Amino acid sequence: ATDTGGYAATAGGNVTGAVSKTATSMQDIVNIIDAARLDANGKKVKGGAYPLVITYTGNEDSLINAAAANICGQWSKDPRGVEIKEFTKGITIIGANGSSANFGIWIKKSSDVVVQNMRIGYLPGGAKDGDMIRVDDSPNVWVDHNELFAANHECDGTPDNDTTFESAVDIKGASNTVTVSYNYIHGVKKVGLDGSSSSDTGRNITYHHNYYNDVNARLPLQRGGLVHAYNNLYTNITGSGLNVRQNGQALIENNWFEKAINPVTSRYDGKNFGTWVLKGNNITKPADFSTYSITWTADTKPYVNADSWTSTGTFPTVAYNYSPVSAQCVKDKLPGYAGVGKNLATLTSTAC
């Protein structure tokens, strides 16, 4: 079906007439997508000729392990990534169990794209937009059951001292409806934007059942629009979590926060603070902060923290259908449903 448990409604390339192809390498993925633009007469078709389901069986563990050992040598290398540009027939890139990639997936001006069961880590090119997953001007995209990692560390002498490694999942432009679910993101400094600038506001994005561990900031850095974050497990957040900016609205429900600094804020602009609706999280009142090691800090410019742990605005009726489990169930069970090799398993109340 087209249900993603979020704003994105897609089946990807898992539709009628889909052509199934197996990619053994990054280059195969590129050659496969390219060939999919040609019709029966060998002539290009705008948006692609047919739907695709690409099963990636490649393994680049040697690159990953080599990079994991020399963290500071990555930012200056050439970035590596597969570009899914202007492909709208529907496409699904799914990793075979045991596969891995030291390259990213950059989606641009496309639609109905599903990325599943991919293990991407320690990407090169942090100083040259070496994102793991980029969703740009692309509606109906589903980023599900992936493991995205690097090192939550900033080396010295990197451009802007913020380029050791780029982001895990950056969303920007007219990527109007996106669902980011069941991903295991760890060891990442900049998790992901939701608007590339003050002017790039909007979109409806859902983050659910994601497991974040040892991440510094941007969970996401929201620029306007709506963000619905439910059933996520946030732990070891070393900087800030959800940063709601430019009057964006967020519904933060049934998540589990632990060992986090500034879990819900609106900072760095000094104005146009966003709002949030808090409900059913493990934290219910300020008393719980001490219980789960939640600390807050101030900013040099005007900011708004959720230290009173109260709702500061409203949120529209959540269009889609979804069944959130309790905050405890997430904390207990989520680590077994998030990531690669979980056969795309989902967490339900019955499993609680």
**Catalytic positions, written as ranges:** 218
* Residue 60 marked in a binding site: no
Place of tokens 């040099």: 300
Residue 253 near Ca ion by CB under 5 A: no
* Residue 147 marked in a binding site: no
Task: Copy the structure tokens of residue 12.
Answer: 């990807």
Judged by beta carbon, residue 191 or residue 264, the one nearer Ca ion is 191
Alpha-carbon gap, residue 22 to 13, rounded angstroms: 14
Place of tokens 């109007």: 176
* Residue 154 marked in a binding site: no
Judged by beta carbon, residue 99 or residue 167, the one nearer Ca ion is 167
Specify the DSSP element, H or E, that contains 29. Answer: helix 26-35
Judged by beta carbon, residue 14 or residue 163, the one nearer Ca ion is 163
Q: Which stretch binds Ca ion (CB under 5 A): 98-106, 159-167, 176-184, 279-287?
A: 159-167
The site map against Ca ion for 111-150 (x = CB under 5 A) is ------------------x-x-------------------
The site map against Ca ion for 55-74 (x = CB under 5 A) is --------------------
Question: ω into residue 220 within 30 of 0, thus cis?
Answer: yes
* Residue 129 marked in a binding site: yes
* DSSP annotation string for 293-339: TEE----SS--EE-TT----S------S------HHHHHHHGGGTSS
Judged by beta carbon, residue 172 or residue 228, the one nearer Ca ion is 172
Euclidean distance between the first and the last CA atom of the chain, given in angstroms as a whole number: 25
Q: Which stretch binds Ca ion (CB under 5 A): 30-38, 84-92, 169-177, 328-336?
A: 169-177
**Residue 113 CB, nearest distance to Ca ion (Å)?**
18
Alpha-carbon gap, residue 149 to 158, rounded angstroms: 19
CA-CA-CA-CA torsion for 60, 208, 135, 178, nearest 10 degrees? 140
Q: Which of 60, 136, 147, 170 binds Ca ion (CB under 5 A)?
A: 170
Give the residue ranges of the annotated binding site for Ca(2+): 129, 131, 166, 170
Residues of the shown chain interacting with Ca ion in the complex, contacts defined by CB under 5 A: 129, 131, 166, 170
